[PDB]
Amino acid sequence: SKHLSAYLDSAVANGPELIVEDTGLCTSFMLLDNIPSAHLTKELIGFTWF
Amino acid sequence: KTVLSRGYIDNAQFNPLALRSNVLLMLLQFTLSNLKINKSSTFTSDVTTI
Amino acid sequence: TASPADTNVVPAKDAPTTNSPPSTTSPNQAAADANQQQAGIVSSQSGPNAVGDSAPSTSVNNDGDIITRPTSDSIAAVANATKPAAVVSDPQSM
RNA sequence: UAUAUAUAUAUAUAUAUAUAUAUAUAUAUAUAUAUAUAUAUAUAUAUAUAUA
RNA sequence: UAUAUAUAUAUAUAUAUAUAUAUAUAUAUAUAUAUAUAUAUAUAUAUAUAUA
């Protein structure tokens, strides 16, 4: 676009942006907690390895 | 408020009479927003339990 | 040599009505004249071809009416002309 | 006819200046919206004074 | 109870100031394109001078 010098009421055609790619997750709906929890006791922590 | 709403509608109202068109355009934007290619990423081998 | 400006020529945006002057009298004839003059043609060389022609103009509505502002504003204007008060104060209200 | 010099015109290149258009940034002005402050007007409440 | 005046608070309207957002105009800077002018170089044409 350093030059777009079309004569009179015209324009210089450009190619549409076709190649667009994504590497995340193919989704558009999200899961969320609308209301926070009450912060209960855990009663179990996690895995142990040795 | 995509169309037929700018100028008169309140900031907190929607016009029921224009609902279909507004929904229609909203879905269209939703459709266009996802037009992209599902690229492949790298991979790792899992060794975690099951 | 291979100048893109001479190869990628396409109509610009808002091409069909861009030159239309803002008026209410005879928008289509006026727009047609503006196009003719804009294109570099002079009336003395176009001859009889310049007299009856008409072209689309922004001052003309799609319905075929003379408009002076964007149609949304016209919709907004009529809408705003009718807005009864939501909460009123009268002595007998329970 | 040939050579050399000078002038003028035309073409091409480079530099400089000016104008116009487009893009980007900054500033100012005007309009519209929202927030905050001050002033003025109107209404309501409370206090005080005066009149009935 | 009512009226008037003064003070304070609250609401609404108008004006002014400041901040933020959006639009339009103008100015300045930078980049790109086009036009015009001037200078320099090269080529071609014409005129003039000198030599053969």
Q: Which of C79, C80, C29 is closest to C59 using CA atoms?
A: C29
Instruction: Identify the DSSP state of C87.
Output: S
Distance (Å, rounded) from C-alpha C28 to C-alpha C57? 6
Tell me which of B38, B41, B48, B49 to substitute to probe the interface with A (most A C-beta atoms closer than 10 Å).
B38
Contact between the CB of A12 and strand D at under 7 Å: no
Contact between the CB of A38 and strand D at under 7 Å: no
Nearest to A20 among B37, B40, B41 (CB): B37
Tell me which of B8, B13, B15, B17 to substitute to probe the interface with C (most C C-beta atoms closer than 10 Å).
B8
Cβ–Cβ gap B38/A20 under 8 Å: no
Q: Which amino acid is at A34?
A: N
Distance (Å, rounded) from C-alpha C40 to C-alpha A7? 12
Specify the DSSP element, H or E, that contains A11. strand A10-12
Contact between the CB of A4 and strand D at under 7 Å: yes
Q: Which of C7, C61, C55 is closest to C31 using CA atoms?
A: C55
Resolution (A): 3.3
- Residue C66, sorted as left (phi over 0), alpha (psi -120 to 50) or beta, turns out to be beta
- Strand duo A21-22 + B37-38: pairing: parallel
The number of C-alpha atoms within 13 Å of C65 and in the hemisphere containing its C-beta is 7
Q: CB within 8 A of B28, min separation 6: which ones?
A: none
